[PDB]
Symmetry: C3
C-alpha cells in the first residue's frame, strides 16, 4: 500500500491479484489538477509494469469519485488564454490491459464521469450526482464523451445527457433503465471488491484475451472521435 509522487492517489493491494487505485486530491475534490493527472498516469503505469494484478478498482474518497476539468482550467479556455488539449486521463481504464471496475461511490462530473465510463464495469452510488456537463460551459463535449456515453448508456439517453449537460442522481439513472449496478454509497466499494475477487478467479491470460477482443472496437474508433470532437471546438 503506497502513495504516488504527489500523494493524491493511493494504491492499495486488496489481495495479491487486485489493485485499488484510490483518488484523493481532497483540495480539488478529485478534479483533474496537475497533481491528480500525474499521480493517475503514474498509478496506471505502475499497474502496466506489474502484471501480477488481474483486476483494478478505481475509486474516489468520501463523496467524490472524480470532478473533471478544474474550474480554473475551464475558465482559461472560455477566455482568450488556453485551448482544449487532448490528454489521456479519460482513456486510462480503456488502455489498461486488465478489467477495471469504476466504483463511483461519489459524484462523477464532466471528464471525471467520462473517465469512469471507459472502465469495463461501472457501479454508481444512488445518492451521488453524475453529469457530462461540458455544454454548461458553452463547449461541445470532449474526452471521448460523444463516443463512450452512447456506447455505455445507449444512443437515446446519451442525446439528452450530452445536449443538455444535466445533473442526474444515481437514483434518477437507475429509474431510467441504466445497465450499471446502482447501490447506496456505503455499499459501492464492498460490492466492487467482491466482484474483483470473482474476476481474479479467472486465468489472467483469459481475462486479458477477452478484454482485448471486447474493447478492440473502442480502442480502434476512439482516436477518430477525439479528432471530431477537437474539430467541434474548432
Amino acid at each position: 500500500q503506497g502513495p504516488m509522487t504527489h500523494s493524491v492517489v493511493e494504491l492499495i493491494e486488496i489481495e495479491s491479484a487486485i489493485i485499488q487505485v484510490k483518488m484523493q486530491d481532497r483540495t480539488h475534490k478529485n478534479a483533474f489538477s496537475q497533481e491528480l493527472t500525474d499521480d493517475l498516469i503514474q498509478a496506471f503505469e505502475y499497474i502496466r509494469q506489474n502484471p501480477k494484478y488481474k483486476a483494478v478498482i478505481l475509486t474516489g474518497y468520501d463523496n467524490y469519485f472524480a470532478s473533471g476539468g478544474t474550474q480554473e482550467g475551464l475558465l482559461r479556455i472560455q477566455q482568450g488564454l488556453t485551448k482544449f488539449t487532448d490528454d489521456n486521463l479519460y482513456s486510462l481504464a480503456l488502455d489498461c490491459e486488465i478489467p477495471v471496475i469504476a466504483a463511483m461511490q461519489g459524484h462523477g462530473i464532466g471528464g471525471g464521469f467520462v473517465m469512469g465510463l471507459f472502465a469495463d464495469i461501472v457501479i454508481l452510488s444512488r445518492e451521488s450526482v453524475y453529469t457530462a456537463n461540458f455544454m454548461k460551459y458553452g463547449f461541445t463535449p470532449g474526452m471521448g464523451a460523444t463516443f463512450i456515453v452512447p456506447k455505455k448508456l445507449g444512443f437515446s439517453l446519451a442525446q439528452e445527457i450530452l445536449l443538455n449537460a444535466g445533473s442526474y442522481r444515481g437514483a434518477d439513472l437507475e429509474k431510467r433503465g441504466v445497465p450499471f449496478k446502482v447501490l447506496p454509497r456505503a455499499e459501492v466499494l464492498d460490492y466492487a471488491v467482491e466482484l474483483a475477487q470473482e474476476l481474479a478467479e479467472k486465468p489472467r491470460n483469459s481475462l486479458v484475451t477477452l478484454k482485448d477482443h471486447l474493447v478492440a472496437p473502442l480502442r480502434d474508433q476512439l482516436p477518430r472521435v477525439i479528432e471530431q470532437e477537437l474539430m467541434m471546438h474548432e
Copy 2:
C-alpha cells in the same frame, strides 16, 4: 412579442414559448392527428419556418388532448396498398432528424404507426404513462415503413424492437417503462410541462454549440437512414400489394 399562430390549414399551431423555444402543436382533431393532407402540409410548413428562422434553440413537437400522432389515415394506407402512392411521397418521418436544432417529442397522447415513428426521430422523446404506443404496420399485413426498422432498434434497442416491429402490439407508456426504455415516462398531465422545462434548460446553451453537437451526434443516423428507406420500400413491394392487406386495413383500422 411572442407569437402564436396557425399553419395554412390550421391543424398545426406554432407558439413561441420563450424567445428561443418554439412549440409545434399538432391539432387535426377531425383525424386524431393522423397524417391527413392538411396535417402533412402544415407539419412540413412548420419545420420549414423553423429552418428559415435560425434563432430557436429547441423545438417541442406535441399533440392535443389524448393524441400525439396516429399515423396513416385509412384512405392513405389504402392508396399505398393500391400502388397509387408510397410512404416516401412526403417525408414526414425525418422532420425532427433533419431539423438542425434539438427536437423534443412530447408524446402526451397516443403514438400509432408512422405517428409514433416520426416522433422517435426526435432527439429527446417523452411518453405518457396512460397512452398507447404501437408500430402497428404488421397488423395490416405489411412491413414497417417510415424508417421504423432503423429508428426503433436505434432508440429502444435491438431486442425490444424485434418484438415491437414483428408483432405490431400496443403498449401503454407504463408497459414500455417497465420493459426498461430510456425515455422519460410521466402522467400525461405532466408531459408537456416537463418538455417545456427541458427546453428551457437546453435554451441556456449557445445555439451554435447545440447545432454543432447535434450534427455530430446524429451524423450516423443521417448517413445510414437512406439505405434502410430503400430496403423498406423493397419490403413494401413484397408485402403491401396483396389483397389481404386491403381487407385488413378495411377491417382492423
Copy 3:
C-alpha cells in the same frame, strides 16, 4: 427422442427439449434431435412461429462435462453442429421461452431467438470463463447485441450466475415472468404473431436479422482466435473437473 414437437392451434410449433437424463445439456441425443427439429421446421412452410422451451426447471444447460473436456483437449469446438445459430437460421420468428435455467451454450443458443422470455426463479449465465475458456458460440456478439455492451462486459468477463429477477432489476429488455407463466405467455405471443401473413413475418425477419447473419461468421472467427490462445491449458481441464455443476 429427447425433443418433442407439438403443434399449437394452426401454425405454431413448439420444440420442447426434454433430455431429462442430462438436464438439457447438449448430449449427442439433444444435439441430433434439435438439428432434426429445426430441419423439419425448415421443410414445413405451414408454421409461422416457433416456441423453443425446456421441461420442469431446465431450459438448456450447455456442454456436458465430457463435451467440455473434448473441447479442452482440442477434439471438438463449441460451434460444432451450429446449435448456437439454430434460431437465427430459422426463417420464421422463434420465441425462446426460458421457463428454466439457461447455462453456457444453452443460454447463448436461446439468445439468438427473435423474442426471449426469462423466468424470475431460474439462473442464467454465460459461464465459459469460470473454466478459463473465452466465450464461444457467438456469445461475444449476441450478448451485447441483445443485452447492450455494458451489461455484456460483466456477463462475459465474470461468468456470474443471475436469477431472472436479478436481470429484470438490471434493466433487460426481455419479458421476465414467474416460471409457471412463461410458456402461457409465449403461446399468447405466438398466436399474435400467427395473425400475420407468413411472407410478411419472413420478409421482415430476414431484414431485422440481416446484420446478425452477415456479421456472425466474422465474429465466430474472432472467437476461435481467442479460443486458440486460451482453451488448451492444463488449468482449463482442472477447472472443468472441479467446477462443473458447482
